[PDB]
Amino acid sequence: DEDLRFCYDILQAVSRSFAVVIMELDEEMRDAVCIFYLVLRALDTVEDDMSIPVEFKLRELPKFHEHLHDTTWCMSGVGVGRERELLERYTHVTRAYSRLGKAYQDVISGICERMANGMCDFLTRKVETKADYDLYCHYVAGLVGHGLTLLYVSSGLEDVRLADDLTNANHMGLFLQKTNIIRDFYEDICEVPPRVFWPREIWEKYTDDLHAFKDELHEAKAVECLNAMVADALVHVPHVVEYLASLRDPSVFAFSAIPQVMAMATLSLVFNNKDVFHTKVKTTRGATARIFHYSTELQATLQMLKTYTLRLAARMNAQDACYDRIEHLVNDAIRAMESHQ
Amino acid sequence: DEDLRFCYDILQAVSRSFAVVIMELDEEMRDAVCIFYLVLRALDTVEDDMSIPVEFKLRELPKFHEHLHDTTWCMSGVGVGRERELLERYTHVTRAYSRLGKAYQDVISGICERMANGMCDFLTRKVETKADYDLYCHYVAGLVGHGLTLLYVSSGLEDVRLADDLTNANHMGLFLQKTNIIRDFYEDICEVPPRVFWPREIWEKYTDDLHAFKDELHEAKAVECLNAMVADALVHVPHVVEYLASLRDPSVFAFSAIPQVMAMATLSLVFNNKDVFHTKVKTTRGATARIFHYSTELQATLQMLKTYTLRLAARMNAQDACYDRIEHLVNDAIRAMESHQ
Amino acid sequence: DEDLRFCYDILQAVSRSFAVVIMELDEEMRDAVCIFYLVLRALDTVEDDMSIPVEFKLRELPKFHEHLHDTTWCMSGVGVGRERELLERYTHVTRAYSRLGKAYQDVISGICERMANGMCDFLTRKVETKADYDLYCHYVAGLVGHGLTLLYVSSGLEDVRLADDLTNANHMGLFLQKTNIIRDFYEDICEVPPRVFWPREIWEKYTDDLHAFKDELHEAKAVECLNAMVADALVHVPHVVEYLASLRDPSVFAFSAIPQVMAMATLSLVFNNKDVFHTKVKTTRGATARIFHYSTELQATLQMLKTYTLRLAARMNAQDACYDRIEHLVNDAIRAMESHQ
Amino acid sequence: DEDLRFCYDILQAVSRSFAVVIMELDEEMRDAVCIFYLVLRALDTVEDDMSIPVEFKLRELPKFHEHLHDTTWCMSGVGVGRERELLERYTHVTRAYSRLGKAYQDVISGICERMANGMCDFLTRKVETKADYDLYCHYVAGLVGHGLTLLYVSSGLEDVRLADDLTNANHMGLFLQKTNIIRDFYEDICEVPPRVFWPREIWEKYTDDLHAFKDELHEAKAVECLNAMVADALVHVPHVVEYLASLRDPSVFAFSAIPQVMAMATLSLVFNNKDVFHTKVKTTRGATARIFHYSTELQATLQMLKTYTLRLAARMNAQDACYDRIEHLVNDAIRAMESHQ
């Protein structure tokens, strides 16, 4: 039992806000989602640990799920901060895992493995094309959508038809990952070594070297690339909407909707905004407090999404290059919203 | 005795051209500049590789010179071709190094570390201004000039007073390095990632983007910039002439003069020549043979420099922006040349 | 209006010729232009009083335009002769200013402000390059060009299309300023302290000390420097031609053409004329009367510019270093002239 | 630790006052400023030895910065007092320097070289004009200002933006050097040879021979000229307060402010005072102890600067030749100050 409490404490420490979002769910769903989070979290620590050998990761990850049974396993010497602990004391995790609906355990193990291997793939090669981009996001966040959607069905709160086609569930994942990948460009490019996520295929058209955007001598082509990333992210909106509109349970909806609304808001703030290149553009807490408050039912979350996407549209002028394209994707989004209002 | 032979063989394989000039010098000093060449070439290769962490270099380069005193040291996998062969078999260099005059050993070591540290500085940032440009060239070539002038004095072949002021020697290095950077513009910008050296302080007056010079459309702006670049290099000629006129030894002179003449000849051909932007402009093998044959004594090499400098001026029109600047810089080169006849 | 009269009376006292040329304008615009002239002349008086400290100029210039809406304002310890009277009685100008259309007041105020700032910048540093030369001329002359153009549009006499690209207008002030700087060399360098406007970037090719041009010893290079300066002013002729041809109003035309024709006449006179280095070269009163008489319509003024341009060219021969440079520029101007015949 | 201790020991022996001020700095920064000071002091010792032939200085000074990489270099026949011990045991400085940190080494290296070249400019000529005076001040003090600012930034204690425009850093240095050159007029001129810093452009308006000011005979003009020198010095105050107002770190602030406040108090005391000509005017120990204690934050140091400027102002009568000009300079200073209160 003190295992469950450990998982929730490490979570509160590892992901501040998500530790609030997860509280929307009922303990049963809550327990699985928390386990699921930590499992993927540990897995993410290994992949990101720059201080250790690659061949080591390739020989580990592929069987990281296997450990979900060995209540004595753990990794002391990996990652930093809380993560390191999560691994060294990874026993409580599996100890909690052990006592979850059989079905839940299968989604976790399943998704974990799939993501692990997926991570390996991109651990060798690099992301240069948009196809690389989307596929990486699939392994990194899309699969979380698959897993969470499979958990929703399993639990019984949502209709099994929801898990039939996971295309939109994938879109939910990607939309969150891309919005975050865009917002954290600077924070990540400053890392040691520098972490880059923007696809070569997109920025190549705006510069010869990514690190160039740090110097505003290149703002022009910096923002212009930013707008192109924001545009590539908007593609998903229409699908996030459908997915949300298909949800029926009040718990699963709020849990699924809040993060999406948070991303749209963030996206409408980093769009056509050079501050992204020298700092972390963030939403105000009032704004997130309001988002967390009204994102409990379809109609209300639709008006918020609309409001944010419209504000993003206001960010530009006819002058701006990306205009015709953004206007397009935006109207494709509002249309999607209107058909559910 | 097998060690030295290895050096001259790899030297021959790498910089085939220089491999002939060095053969000009007497065996004792010849070994010096040979090992000197290789050390800096080894260093340059390390710094070169595009598949190595910046952080690695920024740490390993500044300590490179320390390996010269470790006959066991070598590097495993970096830099294709014969370069690979140097860093792996670097062993034979250190050996040879060990048996050279202490003074020689010190010159090589001093220049090396100063160069490595200069390269490090430019690993993090780019060449944006003329100062940046003159400083970058100083690190990768001007110092080579500093080093060669010290070996000359150390050797007794030249009068100690030669190393009193190393400003002109620095000019010698800069003159070669710039002619090269100018001449290899296309070959360098077509690299991955692109290699850019022309300073923004200069080209920003002719374009907003350097890659624009690859298209015929911008051919007019490309050339004007090329000429501004050629003007910047001519700044050094008077000093080169000064330096050559100060050498008293035939062997050292021929070795110092030949590369300089080759450079002016190349400069007179790339200047105001649009081919620079799609091919590698070079003098005819007959011309270099002619230069190698006669650049053995001051008067002869001065009238060859004069000749090329005059051929250069005859390529521009009274309607080319660079008219005044070039005509001035040219008339200035010739005066310094006439000042020694 | 005791004010509008003081203006014209000081105008005449300060500048005889302009006082005759301004009469080509119709009253409304004439008052505007007269005021405009005095405001800028006041700025000139300050920037030029070498007896007062720079701290004063950098303090007063930037906020000079503010005084325009402050009748009762004046300055009592700056300038000589009438200029000094202008400032100590500036109230007569601001009053008159006040009674002008807002459209006029605004242009005068705008240009005044930007010229002050230009003057403040070149008070902190000196003109070394051609770019500095062109920019300084832009601040003290070209800007006046812009101002007159806006006034012509604001009055309705000229079509608004005139203010689309103020580039040719800038060329207009630049041609007069340069021909003038060229002609006043001796007078300028003889003042206490010496005044210098020829840019180092141009004369550094002929001398190390511009004062050397006063001695016959250096006559040969002085003439070459003068001719290079002329070559530099001839660049603007084609544009002055374009600008003149775009004018539809007879008054604006006469007012704008006469000074340009006077300048060309003068330029043709100082060209390749060693006398520039010891005296003030001028056109005969007969020729300036002929010029004032015919510069009323495009064709006539077009043939006069041609005639002076041909005279200019005729004053040179093969041996002259500048021959090619000059012959090129001449044909370019002739062409633009015939290009409208 | 031994090398570093020798540096602080010689610093205290050689520059008593600065030895105290530097203790306002913390750790890495204090070491770097210490080495910086000694390096410029060693340089200054060589440039000032009159037994050293010019040709040597002209050749050795531009290379001085190069000795920083030579941990065996030193000099033995130059310097007075422990200045000799410094050059004799320079290996301590060079050695301590090698352990500073790339960023610090380059600042020190660059400024040293730039100062060295500037000194050479003035070993061949003398200060005649106001511009010469400023350039000279820039070379010996202004550059220190540039150097200190870079070191602040490189330490991270101040915002990187601080170094975008080093103009005010220059004024900071110039205010100190000028106040100093004024206060020490007599001591300077009373040497063999006599030390003269006051620029001809200023004093020739008051006398034909500068020594004339030692006689209470020419006294009247000595003070009128003294006042002119102070006026020229007050020019920098508004810029000095701008600089101080832009600092965020307490240590860096105290270190930067104390000397400026000392200069203003001294300046307000030497102003319009005949004693400057036969005695070294100083502030009371109590006054200087008060400045050291309160110059810890902006508001308090501004209050003190205000006090000393007004005290300076109130030492002249309306009948003084410098009245109006000093009054304006004073007002410029005070407005500036209020601008930050």
Ligand SMILES: CC(C)=CCC/C(C)=C/CC/C(C)=C/CSP(=O)(O)OP(=O)(O)O
């Ligand atoms: C339901 C469905 C189909 C898909 C769900 C999509 C995914 C991948 C959801 C995970 C949500 C999380 C962990 C959000 C963190 S709050 P934040 O974004 O503000 O950043 P933080 O992790 O707290 O640092």
Ligand SMILES: CC(C)=CCC/C(C)=C/CC/C(C)=C/CSP(=O)(O)OP(=O)(O)O
């Ligand atoms: C004597 C003195 C003061 C300075 C000497 C200046 C310098 C830096 C000389 C190095 C000369 C070299 C290596 C020329 C290569 S021939 P290449 O240019 O055609 O190209 P390659 O290296 O053969 O591929």
Ligand SMILES: CC(C)=CCC/C(C)=C/CC/C(C)=C/CSP(=O)(O)OP(=O)(O)O
């Ligand atoms: C129309 C346009 C776009 C631009 C006009 C360009 C400028 C700056 C014109 C001002 C003309 C003046 C004041 C000429 C003086 S006659 P003068 O040269 O004989 O000498 P003076 O000033 O009378 O002593």
Ligand SMILES: CC(C)=CCC/C(C)=C/CC/C(C)=C/CSP(=O)(O)OP(=O)(O)O
């Ligand atoms: C921070 C900044 C932008 C500029 C700083 C300006 C400069 C050049 C400062 C040097 C400060 C020194 C050495 C003061 C000593 S007091 P003293 O002259 O009374 O006694 P001393 O003989 O020099 O020990």
Ligand SMILES: CC(C)=CCC/C(C)=C/CNCCN[C@H]1[C@@H]2C[C@H]3C[C@@H](C2)C[C@@H]1C3
């Ligand atoms: C919510 C459950 C069950 C799992 C979280 C998914 C998990 C930790 C994935 C590991 N991969 C790192 C990429 N992290 C991304 C996800 C989490 C944050 C918000 C979104 C989605 C963008 C990124 C930061």
Ligand SMILES: CC(C)=CCC/C(C)=C/CNCCN[C@H]1[C@@H]2C[C@H]3C[C@@H](C2)C[C@@H]1C3
């Ligand atoms: C002649 C001895 C002793 C050394 C050569 C100096 C060395 C290998 C410098 C490494 N820096 C890379 C830039 N290389 C430049 C140098 C060699 C080629 C001709 C010149 C000078 C222009 C460039 C191509």
Ligand SMILES: CC(C)=CCC/C(C)=C/CNCCN[C@H]1[C@@H]2C[C@H]3C[C@@H](C2)C[C@@H]1C3
């Ligand atoms: C005609 C109106 C509106 C203003 C006059 C322009 C004015 C006096 C500018 C102040 N800046 C000094 C540069 N003065 C130059 C201009 C006037 C004279 C002939 C030309 C152009 C060369 C110089 C002497």
Ligand SMILES: CC(C)=CCC/C(C)=C/CNCCN[C@H]1[C@@H]2C[C@H]3C[C@@H](C2)C[C@@H]1C3
């Ligand atoms: C503050 C650091 C790091 C160094 C001091 C800079 C240094 C020794 C300059 C040598 N150049 C002679 C000009 N010396 C002047 C400076 C030092 C004293 C106070 C001010 C400023 C007036 C003069 C006496």
